[model samples]
Target: ANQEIFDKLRDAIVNQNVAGTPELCKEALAAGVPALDIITKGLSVGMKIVGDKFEAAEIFLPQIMMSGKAMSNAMEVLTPELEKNKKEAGLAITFVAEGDIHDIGHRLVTTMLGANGFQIVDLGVDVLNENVVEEAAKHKGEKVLLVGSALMTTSMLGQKDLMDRLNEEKLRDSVKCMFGGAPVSDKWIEEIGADATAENAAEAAKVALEVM
Candidate 1:
């Protein structure tokens, strides 16, 4: 029964059924299913499948954009409900590194994570290293997950800088740092001492859940 609903929701998102997306989201919510389950098992799973199709050249940017918008619309219906469950809402801090302005990927991750029940502290594009640390400090002792992204090779240094500062300030172990972007790799993460490195947003969320 739940699997059937999941498939319908997935199809709505993939097909860009804007009007139906929110209606399905509300239905999933009313069914007494956990919001996180609806996001992961239905929404994120569907997005991932379609995104993979896009990557494989089976779908174009137009489809990707529409699907993303549909997912975002669905999230709009879920956010307030998640906030009302604040204590139950998992928390994570995510941002694009300083000097990097490209944030499409980060934005996708934020949307998916937010829908997955994470109370995201998004610092937005071109966020400085100091701000990441400060935000983590502000959310201390509450399953704070630190995530940094850089799309350019030059800006990748910001990840190392943030990690070093966290270690220098003795906050390294307190927070979990996950690094990614077009230019980032597991090797770079290891060199910079990041807790984990995700090739994409879905992997990043999986790592975050494990970290917490």
Candidate 2:
């Protein structure tokens, strides 16, 4: 029964049925499907398929945006139940690096992470390296993930600088860093000593969940 509802919910998101997605979420909740399961088995799975389509050039920006909007709508219905069940999946300080103004991707990642049970401290766009390091420092002993995105060549450099600052502060070993945006790659992440990067919002949440 839950799997059947999951399939419907996944289809609603994949098909970008913004208006119908929330209704499906409510149905899943009423049918006793757990909120997290709705996100993982339904919404996240749907987003993964969308990501695959995107990479293969089967879809483009507007299509991805519509599916993302559908995911967000469904999240509105699921968030309260998730809060009640609260997994406390660890803390993430998210931002777009200094010199980059693009925030849509950053916002998507924040929303997806929040939906998946991670606590978020969104620092918004064009944030400085020190600010990120200081924020992670504030959390002290707890496991914290620093997430940053940059769509510009110049701004992308901030990601590496941020890593250097973290190392300088000797905070490198204590916190995990995740980077994304148009130009970021696994090789770049490893080179900068950051932990992970994902192709899209769902995968970002998946990576953060794994790290935490």
Candidate 3:
């Protein structure tokens, strides 16, 4: 059943069998397990385990990176279904501010949110405050959350600037706003006027849904 499919997919990722992951994901889809479950129920579980092992010193960066690669490969095969399912769940915007090249964190958050039925709009790294404000406005009616990440304090400042511009257009309070990454603490979130904060991608998705 799907539990077997889930096991295969999870094993493929944990073992860093990148080539095997997409095949496993395809099998899950062929077995009529919803594509979303193949992602949320299978791949993500593997990633969390990967993350845990890394934190516990049971795994190194190379293995962790490989697991992430396996997940990404499988995600590519499943993204279409994810995109097609979130039409009404509303958009969730994600980005990394200027002077930062921390796109991986944002991408991680984006995929997790996508799997949870949010239409993720990745605005990419080195994003300017102005662009975030503009993008937030473009989908205000359909957007539920705005996510910003920063790897440095300098870049983190841009998130507040983004809020200022959004508030000016009356879009700030219209949706939930979240900030994450190395430079951000709950204190920073409060200082930046963010509605919430998440330490990792999975929590980001959960927080996005709850506050949305």
Find the candidate with the highest TM-score and give its number.
3
On a 0 to 1 TM-score scale, where does candidate 2 land against the true structure? 0.65
Q: lDDT score, residue 105, model 2? A: 67
Candidate 1 residue lDDT tens string, 179-206: 8786887788789887887765567667
Runs in model 1 lying further than 4 Å from the true structure? 88-93, 98-121, 130-145, 149-158, 164-176, 180-188, 197-212
Stretches off by above 4 angstroms in model 3 are 86-92, 97-121, 130-145, 149-176, 180-191, 196-212
Best of the candidates, lDDT: 2
Q: Cα RMSD to native, each candidate?
A: 5.2, 4.9, 4.7
Summed over model 3, clashes come to 0
Per-residue lDDT tens digits for candidate 2, residues 1-212, read 57888899888877888899999999889988887688878887887798889889998988888997888777777766654633468888999999776775687678778777888899998898998898999996797888899978789977888999888899888988899997897788888788889977768888999987
Model 3 C-alpha lDDT per residue in residues 4-119, reported as the tens digit of each score: 88977877878889889998888888888887678667887787788788879998989977887787777678766555544236677888889897565677678778778877
Local distance difference test values of all predictions, in order: 0.77, 0.84, 0.79
Structural similarity to truth (TM-score) of each candidate: 0.65, 0.65, 0.66
Ranking, lDDT, top scorer first: 2, 3, 1
